[PDB]
Design a protein around this ligand. Structure first.
Ligand SMILES: CCCCCCCCCCCCCCCCCC(=O)OC[C@H](CO[C@@H]1O[C@H](CO[C@H]2O[C@H](CO)[C@H](O)[C@H](O)[C@H]2O)[C@H](O)[C@H](O)[C@H]1O)OC(=O)CCCCCCCCCCCCCCCCC
Ligand SMILES: CCCCCCCCCCCCCCCCCC(=O)OC[C@H](CO[C@@H]1O[C@H](CO[C@H]2O[C@H](CO)[C@H](O)[C@H](O)[C@H]2O)[C@H](O)[C@H](O)[C@H]1O)OC(=O)CCCCCCCCCCCCCCCCC
Ligand SMILES: CCCCCCCCCCCCCCCCCC(=O)OC[C@H](CO[C@@H]1O[C@H](CO[C@H]2O[C@H](CO)[C@H](O)[C@H](O)[C@H]2O)[C@H](O)[C@H](O)[C@H]1O)OC(=O)CCCCCCCCCCCCCCCCC
Ligand code: CLA
Ligand code: CLA
Ligand code: CLA
Ligand code: CLA
Ligand code: CLA
Ligand SMILES: CCCCCCCCCCCCCCCCCC(=O)OC[C@H](CO[C@@H]1O[C@H](CO)[C@H](O)[C@H](O)[C@H]1O)OC(=O)CCCCCCCCCCCCCCCCC
Ligand SMILES: CC1=C(/C=C/C(C)=C\C=C\C(C)=C\C=C\C=C(C)\C=C\C=C(C)\C=C\C2=C(C)CCCC2(C)C)C(C)(C)CCC1
Ligand code: OEX
Ligand SMILES: [Cl-]
Ligand SMILES: [Fe+2]
Lengths: 37, 92, 136, 248, 50, 34, 50, 33, 150, 333, 145, 59, 29
């Protein structure tokens, strides 16, 4: 368990690790925005 | 052997042989499986049930609990393929 | 068929008194048992020592009788051998060996009651597989 | 090397080297004169040469001779840590083996490609020394029995065994359905387990009194394996060295 | 077998004889390539100069 | 059997050195275009 | 170097083979013999060698 | 109330839509996307 | 504990079901685990002597903590499934556990091979591009037509 | 002109009937010794104990086997992962008793196939073509390595490798199913999809190309005789084939850049086989397939069987029977 | 029927819902992810485990006075095995029994002595092993406090 | 306080991340608005130092 | 005695393979 100070901020930590995967996708969505130039 | 004659005394029936059955057979009798059945199965062949009570070391309490079930035990001729597997039959 | 009132009644004491487990109890047990007991007693069998099973028949032949909630709870408080000659707390999970096994450092009474209730109740549901083994 | 030298070596220094089978030597010939009630705490029996009784013709005549044979199993044959109580009936030392690693599965290959498996064992041994003090020149001798190479729990390739398995050859159902069914096959369907006999003769050599250790040379002749009564067993002759420590 | 071992030389003979093969190759290779110090081509994997 | 080990250790180092010094002998230059 | 320094003078590292059970200890005397160190590098990768 | 669910869905929420918001703004302000 | 004389009970094959001899002569555990006789663990070393597994230490000087450690390790083996059922493939799903060793080994083996594939691809392309025929052949300087027939 | 130079030249020559190259210096001797030992052992190898329980198994033709039952039995379980060359045995007979030829053949075969990949690339470089055929050949090489080397490494014994034979292969597959549940692993599914798709695309591409063949032959002469080696124009009409394919399924759905079509043809089975070899490699470290055992439960709690439970039943049947005498304890670890 | 939306639009279930992360009422699931509670029921921190720890320390002594006999003979595996097989519980026992600063510091001294004994026994140096055993004896019999 | 202090830090980090990537891209935008970004960076590092000081003290 | 037949078949197949590599129709352009 997190220290008692940050147990309130726990839900952000619940999603933080999966962020990078989304960066990947962003590349794809960015390429889609520019018409796969 | 293709047919052991004393199948019923291996643990299937209420009568259990003391010179052939594995330690798992001494589970129908409460208060006997550890420290009592092990002594019986860890020692040599017995000509009769009375030979159990001379088993070296056999404590009193063990003698009493054996006397409680003396009727169910029986003594048959030993068979090597079964006496070798008294401690660990193989099945679990 | 449901998990009705009739099937949730289990023996609570040697006498034979039969109490009833609330559905919450059932859930908590199944959870606690799977979390702590499950690794070695999955399916109602003892993985390390298959001779001493967990099915009601073997509990009925233990010394003393272990086929009721009270004796199971006491066994958790103080475990003994199959014939009850001595204590095996140093080689088995127990409240007495809480220092040795850190898993029980948090278990409460209700927790023990629910675990014992689950152990008693599961053979009433499955009725042939609790402790049966591969074959079943 | 002696036990006092192996105890200096650590386990990492010994692994793989292959000296785990070797028997420690004994130096400084002396007499023990065991106190009655003492017993041999350790005992290693190492075979140095194997031979199988065979028929071979020298000059047009055939006679029973023991032919040499190389061992197929790598480094398993040696026995060790055998314990037994020494007693004196009429002033004679009797080993009387009691417990310890005393069996060892071993396979040896004869000239011509024949493979002869056998159980190199010392069980229920009863030695009869030629006196008392284990002193240079002592002899023990004795007899022992050899258990079945395969126990009851073993299954044949077709699934037949003694304590467990099919009682008949399920692959051939036409052998059934006929009054006298599987009979020619009864010799193989039926699994019998019989104990054999072995004769060992141990001669003592240099004996250390300070460490209470004895060493010498043994000659043993044991009956080979019978495949649960399917084949007649062979005769195996073995010779080698030994070592034992007496605790008083 | 499992005796660790620097490379797998157990007998000085084995090392001293795995030696001449590599040295024979070094000599035959030196026969072509000798007295080379400079000639820097400065190009992508050219090595055109012999 | 030490002789057999010696002969195999030769063959192996023989061919391995052949490989190593063959790929060291200006292989990238060996090519259709020059 | 930083890892070595951490294990030697910055609280130590966890050692299972420590006497009395696994615990954090300082590695006071690391083995510096080149032969024993490179025995790992130059040994066989098969069973019993690792 | 499983505030855990109402806490874990909406944060996954904000995070998943954020980068696409950056894409919004870049295409809106005629950026060197 | 039952009183059986360990190191004297022949196994079903006659090989010894508790103690065996390693192909180097060392004394090891019997059964199918004879393939793993090279093991060295902190909870089993106290029982090992220069000759291998000492018998006098096993018979007399055994420790309860070793028993607990062995039971815990047997009950938690690096066996599992993709959905992390745990145990043997035929076991019912009550436990929920897959050892981190399995995860690390499988994932990194997969990554390592695909990076070997990356090496193959990039080495080939880099050398072809340096040579100068990574786009095609030429159609006017085809090297096959300039070579002797065969 | 030195000697080394002359050699290097002959070696990298592209006018030899079979290209040698520098990778050939590793491929030829190694593959040749592997095949010689394999041919000899398949005919006259004595029985070998594989489970290390002194129960030798015969796999040679001269020991009452046929082509299907015969095999090169893998090394003994007592050896495990240890290196067992000829010179480590005390006698050749003992080396044969413990299954050394399996180790010899498998190690040489692996080195040979790796050198074969290298040689494919080397000839591609010499002939001035694009160097990626050996990348395609990597997939069978990866599969062979996983089945012959990686799985024994993970399991801890060479006795767990695939025996070199037909019935041995079937036994290996069945035991793999029992102990690992290969079928319910998504990578095996990907491999089956890849192989079925490879066959589908091969058949369809062949049919489409052969169907649209320019009429340049009579009827009493093989259609194949219309094409002449070293042509300058396409012997088939892409337009007609694409029209047929588009009308068959859909207009949008269709490949036109024949280059893209051939790249897809190369891509599908290769990625399938790569994923399958990864399934085997991952499962060598006991990461088995999905276990949906007793997942469906009624209100009371009783279990309702699905199709997966019958698979578990068959797996139990195989498991309790494989290596009947090898086991002494309840768990197969 | 019998829906079960993430514990927000239905109910518990004799077995089906998992989102829960609560819905138990028993009390505090230590963390939203732990079925177990906090250390406030049944087992107490220092019931009578201190007696077991003291017995472990006494038998640790009894084990450690037989090391000089084993080093007098040239046996090194026995020293390591004796120092690790029963001293295993002694590290945790000594760490838990120590509560004051002096006990902590000199238990650290004792651990240093044992580690030196182990290292010297591995290196096979009789003098260093004997001196380290003497220092370990001094620390351990000066620990009983 | 810590809990709150950080909350802020999270909010200011979100406001910074949503606007830095948009700035840099949009040509020119950067330079013109450099000093405000520097001020917000100093605010960010000050918040981090304040959070660290909280903990320390509170332990 | 069937081992002879199996060996003959395998060696014959290998010989056929040998003849198909070194005695092939040379393809000309
Ligand atoms: C072809 C011929 C080349 C063979 C090379 C591969 C052999 C790999 C191998 O036998 O690997 C096994 C060894 C592991 O060694 C093990 O090492 C273990 C070390 O444990 C010891 O040490 C431990 C440390 O405490 C513990 O004490 C343990 O108890 C104790 O036993 C034991 O020694 C085992 O017996 C020993 O097998 O791996 C290693 O050392 C590392 C291996 C490097 C990685 C090799 C990659 C594998 C090849 C994959 C190819 C993919 C296909 C690509 C081609 C297409
Ligand atoms: C055209 C042809 C195409 C052919 C394609 C071939 C490739 C495969 C395609 C089919 C893929 C099917 C996926 C099904 C996923 C699923 O059913 O998911 C279900 C599982 C979870 O299932 C549950 O798993 C739990 C397991 O219980 C465990 O955990 C429980 C809860 O704690 C209990 O504790 C219990 O006791 C304990 O055993 C549940 O209890 C149930 O058993 C079960 O319902 O999800 C998980 O685990 C995570 C699963 C992740 C996905 C698998 C890995 C990635 C696979 C990629 C495959 C394609 C690759 C393509 C490359 C190009
Ligand atoms: C055609 C369709 C398929 C085509 C593929 C392309 C489309 C992708 C489709 C994805 C399908 C799965 C979606 C993701 C679901 C998921 O993952 O499922 C969710 C699960 C998380 O679920 C939790 O998974 C847990 C897994 O147990 C873990 O936690 C347990 C709790 O104690 C135990 O500790 C256990 O030991 C430990 O393993 C339990 O099951 C929990 O009950 C359950 O909630 O996955 C997690 O972990 C989430 C994170 C997984 C990342 C780990 C990936 C790297 C793993 C290394 C694998 C390398 C490859 C090896 C070869 C394969
Ligand atoms: C190699 C790195 C690695 C390793 C070993 C692990 C290992 C683990 N993670 Mg983890 N993780 C990783 C990276 C890694 N992760 C990354 C990068 C992220 C960020 C997204 C996460 C996020 C994450 C979360 C959020 C959780 C885990 C959890 C876990 C544990 C259980 C995993 C599980 O259930 O498997 C599930 C297995 C799968 C879903 C199989 C996926 C297979 C991907 C293959 C895809 C196909 C392939 C790419 C096709 C090839 C294409 C081309 C190359 C040809 C386990 C210890 C869980 C846990 O218990 O933690 C406490 C958990 O809750 N991880
Ligand atoms: C390209 C040629 C080549 C190669 C690479 C090998 C490779 C091998 N042979 Mg071999 N062999 C060959 C030709 C070759 N053979 C030929 C032509 C014959 C017929 C005479 C044989 C006959 C033969 C026998 C009879 C045996 C082998 C064995 C072996 C293996 C162990 C050999 C060893 O320890 O070498 C040691 C060599 C070195 C240490 C020098 C190499 C040093 C450099 C740096 C390479 C390092 C490699 C590293 C891992 C990366 C190894 C896989 C043994 C085997 O398979 O056991 C199972 C075995 O018993 N070989
Ligand atoms: C319809 C059902 C079906 C189908 C289509 C498949 C399909 C497949 N299974 Mg399978 N399987 C099934 C049912 C099925 N399975 C069932 C029911 C079970 C349970 C019993 C299994 C259990 C199973 C296992 C256990 C394995 C498979 C594997 C495979 C794959 C084969 C890999 C292969 O051959 O390429 C790989 C190609 C090679 C290995 C060839 C390499 C060739 C080398 C490089 C050169 C050889 C040269 C040669 C010696 C001489 C040249 C000739 C010269 C003389 C002219 C493939 C995806 C295997 C796998 O996962 O792939 C690794 C595998 O190990 N399956
Ligand atoms: C009506 C006939 C039919 C249909 C529609 C399918 C359809 C399917 N099968 Mg299947 N199968 C069939 C008959 C059929 N099968 C038969 C008769 C057998 C042999 C008994 C198999 C054996 C089989 C195996 C062994 C596997 C499949 C798999 C699959 C899936 C992927 C196959 C794929 O993409 O191939 C390529 C086709 C176009 C690209 C797909 C759902 C695979 C799968 O992933 O299952 C989920 C898989 O592993 N099937
Ligand atoms: C205001 C005064 C103050 C105080 C009392 C502390 C006290 C502490 N800081 Mg700290 N710190 C401060 C100001 C302060 N800091 C400032 C101004 C900065 C720069 C912004 C930092 C940056 C900083 C870092 C980067 C780290 C610390 C760490 C630590 C702890 C290390 C000591 C330890 O393990 O004890 C025992 C303490 C505990 C077991 C719980 C804490 C300790 C509690 C370290 C830490 O917390 O690691 C655990 C650490 O990594 N501090
Ligand atoms: C200075 C740095 C430059 C170093 C260059 C060398 C790089 C090699 C570094 C990796 C170390 C190699 C691991 C040791 C392997 C070894 O020799 O022993 C590994 C085994 C050792 O061999 C066995 O060792 C046993 C150990 O007791 C016993 O002694 C056996 O008798 C002995 O046969 O050797 C081989 O079998 C492997 C060699 C086979 C040759 C493969 C050729 C691969 C192609 C080469 C490609 C060029 C690269
Ligand atoms: C740290 C932090 C954070 C985070 C942040 C970050 C760093 C980032 C995020 C972000 C992210 C990470 C996001 C992402 C997103 C993504 C997405 C949104 C994706 C999607 C995609 C898709 C879905 C696609 C699709 C498509 C298209 C479009 C076209 C083609 C086809 C396809 C299908 C591919 C926060 C805020 C919490 C705050 C605190 C701290
Ligand atoms: O060797 Mn072939 O199969 Ca892999 O698991 Mn354990 O070992 Mn044996 O049993 Mn199951
Ligand atoms: Cl086993
Ligand atoms: Fe084509």
């Amino acid at each position: 368990k997190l220290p008692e100070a940050y147990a309130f901020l726990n839900p952000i930590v619940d999603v933080m690790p999966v962020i990078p995967v989304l960066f990947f996708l962003l590349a794809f969505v960015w390429q889609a925005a520019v018409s796969f130039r | 052997v293709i047919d052991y004659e004393n199948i019923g005394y291996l643990g299937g029936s209420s009568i259990v042989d003391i010179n052939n059955a594995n330690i798992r057979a001494y589970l129908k009798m409460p208060g006997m499986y550890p420290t009592v059945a092990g002594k019986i199965v860890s020692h040599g062949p017995y000509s009769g049930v009375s030979d159990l009570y001379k088993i070296p070391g056999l404590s009193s309490a063990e003698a009493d609990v054996i006397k409680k079930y003396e009727s169910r035990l029986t003594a048959k001729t030993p068979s090597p393929d079964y006496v070798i597997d008294r401690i660990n039959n193989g099945l679990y | 068929i449901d998990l009705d009132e009739a099937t949730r009644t289990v023996v609570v004491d040697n006498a034979g008194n039969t109490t009833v487990l609330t559905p919450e109890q059932v859930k908590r047990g199944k959870r606690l048992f799977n979390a702590t007991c499950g690794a070695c007693h999955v399916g109602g069998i003892t993985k390390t020592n298959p001779n001493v099973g967990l099915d009601p028949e073997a509990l009925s032949l233990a010394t003393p009788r272990r086929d009721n909630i009270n004796a199971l709870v006491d066994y958790i408080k103080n475990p003994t051998t199959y014939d009850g000659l001595e204590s095996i707390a140093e080689v088995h999970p127990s409240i007495k060996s809480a220092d040795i096994y850190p898993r029980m450092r948090s278990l409460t009474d209700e927790d023990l009651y629910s675990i014992a209730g689950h152990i008693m109740l599961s053979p009433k549901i499955a009725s042939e597989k609790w402790g049966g083994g591969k074959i079943y | 090397l002696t036990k006092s030298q192996i105890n200096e070596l650590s386990y990492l220094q010994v692994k793989g080297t292959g000296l785990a089978n070797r028997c420690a030597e004994v130096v400084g010939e002396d007499s023990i004169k065991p106190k009655p009630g003492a017993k041999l705490v350790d005992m290693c029996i190492e075979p140095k040469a194997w031979a199988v009784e065979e028929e071979v013709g020298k000059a047009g005549k055939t006679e029973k001779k023991f032919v040499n044979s190389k061992v197929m199993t790598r480094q398993t044959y040696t026995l060790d840590a055998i314990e037994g109580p020494i007693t004196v009936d009429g002033g004679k030392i009797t080993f009387s083996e009691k417990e310890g690693i005393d069996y060892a599965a071993t396979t040896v290959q004869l000239p011509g490609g024949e493979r002869v498996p056998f159980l190199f064992t010392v069980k229920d041994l009863v030695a009869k020394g030629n006196g008392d003090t284990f002193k240079p020149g002592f002899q023990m001798g004795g007899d022992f029995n050899t258990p079945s190479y395969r126990t009851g729990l073993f299954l044949d390739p077709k699934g037949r065994g003694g304590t467990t398995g099919y009682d008949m050859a399920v692959a051939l159902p036409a052998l059934q359905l006929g009054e006298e069914g599987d009979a020619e096959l009864f010799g193989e369907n039926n699994k019998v387990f019989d104990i054999t006999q072995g004769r060992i003769e141990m001669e003592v050599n240099k004996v250390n009194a300070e460490d209470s250790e004895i060493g010498g040379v043994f000659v043993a002749t044991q009956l080979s394996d019978t495949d649960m009564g399917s084949k007649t067993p062979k005769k195996v002759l073995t010779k080698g060295i030994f070592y034992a420590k007496v605790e008083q | 077998a499992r005796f660790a071992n620097g490379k797998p030389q157990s007998i000085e003979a084995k090392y001293i004889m795995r030696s001449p093969a590599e040295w024979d190759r070094f000599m035959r290779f030196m026969d072509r390539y000798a007295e080379a110090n400079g000639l820097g081509f400065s190009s992508x994997x050219x090595x055109x100069x012999x | 059997m030490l002789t057999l080990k010696i002969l195999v250790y030769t063959t192996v180092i023989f061919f391995v050195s052949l490989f190593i010094f063959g790929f060291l002998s200006s292989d990238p230059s060996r090519n259709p275009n020059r | 170097f930083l890892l070595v320094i951490k294990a030697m003078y910055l609280g130590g590292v966890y050692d299972t083979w420590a006497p009395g059970g696994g615990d954090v200890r300082y590695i006071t005397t690391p083995t510096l013999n080149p032969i024993v160190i490179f025995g790992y590098v130059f040994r066989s990768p098969f069973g019993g060698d690792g | 109330d499983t505030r855990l669910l109402v806490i874990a869905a909406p944060v996954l929420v904000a995070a998943s839509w954020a980068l696409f918001n950056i894409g919004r703004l870049a295409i809106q302000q005629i950026q060197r996307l | 504990r039952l009183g059986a004389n360990v190191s004297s009970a022949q196994g079903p094959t006659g090989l010894g079901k508790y103690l065996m001899r390693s192909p180097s002569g060392e004394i090891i555990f019997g059964g199918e685990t004879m393939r793993f006789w090279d093991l060295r663990a902190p909870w089993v070393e106290p029982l090992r002597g220069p000759n291998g597994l000492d018998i006098n230490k096993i018979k007399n000087d055994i420790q309860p903590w070793q028993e607990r450690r062995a039971a815990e390790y047997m009950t938690h083996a690096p066996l599992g499934s993709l959905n992390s059922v745990g145990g043997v493939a035929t076991e019912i799903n009550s436990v929920n556990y897959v050892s981190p060793r399995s995860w690390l080994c499988c994932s990194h083996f997969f990554l390592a091979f695909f990076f070997l594939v990356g090496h193959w691809w990039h080495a080939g392309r880099a050398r072809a591009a340096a040579a100068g025929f990574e786009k095609g052949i030429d159609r006017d300087f085809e090297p096959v037509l300039s070579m002797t027939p065969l | 002109v030195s000697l080394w130079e002359r050699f290097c030249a002959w070696i990298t020559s592209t006018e030899n009937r079979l290209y040698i190259g520098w990778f050939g210096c590793l491929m030829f001797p190694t593959l040749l010794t592997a095949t010689s030992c394999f041919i000899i052992a398949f005919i006259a190898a004595p029985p070998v104990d594989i489970d290390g329980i002194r129960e030798p198994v015969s796999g040679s033709l001269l020991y009452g086997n046929n082509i299907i039952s015969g095999a090169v039995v893998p090394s003994s379980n007592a050896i495990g992962m240890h290196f067992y060359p000829i010179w480590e045995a005390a006698s050749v007979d003992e080396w044969l008793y413990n299954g050394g030829p399996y180790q010899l053949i498998v190690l040489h075969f692996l080195l040979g196939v790796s050198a074969y990949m290298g040689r494919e690339w080397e000839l591609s470089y010499r002939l001035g073509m694009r160097p990626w055929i050996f990348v395609a050949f990597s997939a069978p090489v990866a599969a062979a390595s996983a089945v012959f080397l990686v799985y024994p490494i993970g399991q801890g014994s060479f006795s767990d490798g695939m025996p070199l034979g037909i019935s041995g292969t079937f036994n290996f597959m069945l035991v793999f199913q029992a102990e690992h549940n290969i079928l319910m692993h998504p990578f095996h599914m990907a491999g089956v999809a890849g192989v079925f798709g490879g066959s589908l695309f091969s058949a369809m591409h062949g049919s489409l190309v052969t169907s649209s063949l320019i009429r340049e032959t009579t009827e009493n002469e093989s259609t194949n005789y219309g094409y002449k080696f070293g042509q300058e124009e396409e012997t088939y009409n892409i337009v007609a084939a694409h029209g047929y394919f588009g009308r068959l399924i859909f207009q949008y759905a269709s490949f036109n850049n024949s280059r893209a079509l051939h790249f897809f043809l190369a891509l599908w089975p290769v990625v399938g086989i790569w994923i399958t070899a990864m399934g085997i490699s991952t499962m060598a470290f006991n990461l088995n397939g999905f276990n949906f055992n007793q997942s469906v439960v009624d209100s009371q709690g009783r279990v309702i069987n699905t199709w997966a439970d019958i698979l578990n039943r068959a797996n139990l049947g195989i498991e309790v029977m494989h290596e009947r005498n090898a086991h002494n304890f309840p768990l197969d670890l | 029927s019998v829906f079960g939306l993430i514990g927000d639009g239905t109910s518990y279930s004799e077995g089906a819902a998992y989102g829960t992360d609560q819905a138990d009422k028993l009390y505090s699931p230590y963390s939203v992810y732990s079925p177990e509670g906090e250390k406030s029921l049944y087992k107490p921190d220092s019931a009578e485990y201190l007696a077991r720890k003291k017995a472990v320390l006494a038998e640790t002594k009894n084990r450690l006075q037989k090391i000089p006999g084993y080093v007098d003979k040239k046996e090194w595996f026995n020293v390591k095995d004796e120092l690790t097989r029963y001293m295993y519980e002694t590290r945790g026992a000594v760490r838990s029994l120590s509560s004051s600063v002096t006990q902590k510091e000199k238990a650290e001294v004792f651990f240093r002595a044992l580690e030196d004994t182990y290292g010297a026994a591995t290196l096979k140096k009789g003098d260093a092993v004997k001196a380290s055993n003497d220092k370990a004896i001094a620390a351990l019999d000066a620990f009983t406090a | 306080m810590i809990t709150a202090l950080t909350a802020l830090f999270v909010l200011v980090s979100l406001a910074l991340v949503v606007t830095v990537p948009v700035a840099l891209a949009t040509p020119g935008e950067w330079e013109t608005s450099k000093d405000q970004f520097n001020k917000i960076f100093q605010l960010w590092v000050g918040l981090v130092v304040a959070i660290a000081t909280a903990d320390g003290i509170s332990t | 005695m069937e081992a002879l037949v199996y060996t003959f078949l395998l060696i014959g197949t290998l010989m056929v393979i040998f003849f198909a590599v070194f005695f092939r129709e040379t393809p000309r352009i």
